[PDB]
Amino acid sequence: GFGCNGPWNEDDXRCHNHCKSIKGYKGGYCAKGGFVCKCY
Numbered sequence: 416g417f418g419c420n421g422p423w424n425e426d427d428x429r430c431h432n433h434c435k436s437i438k439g440y441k442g443g444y445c446a447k448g449g450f451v452c453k454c455y
Contacts, residue, residue, distance in 0.1 A: 416445070416451045416452040417430050417433040417452035418431075418432075418433065418445070419446075419450050421449050422449040424449070425445040425449040426445075427443075427444045427445050430452035431444065433454075434452070440454040440455060442454065
């Protein structure tokens with residue numbers, strides 16, 4: 416996923432910052448297995 420490329424590399428901060436220039440997302444984090452960039 417976005418930034419979250421697996422449990423060996425969780426870029427919570429490319430995840431938080433794909434979502435966070437897009438109005439609608441205040442942030443995000445690696446949710447599922449370090450692969451899914453879950454944003455809110």
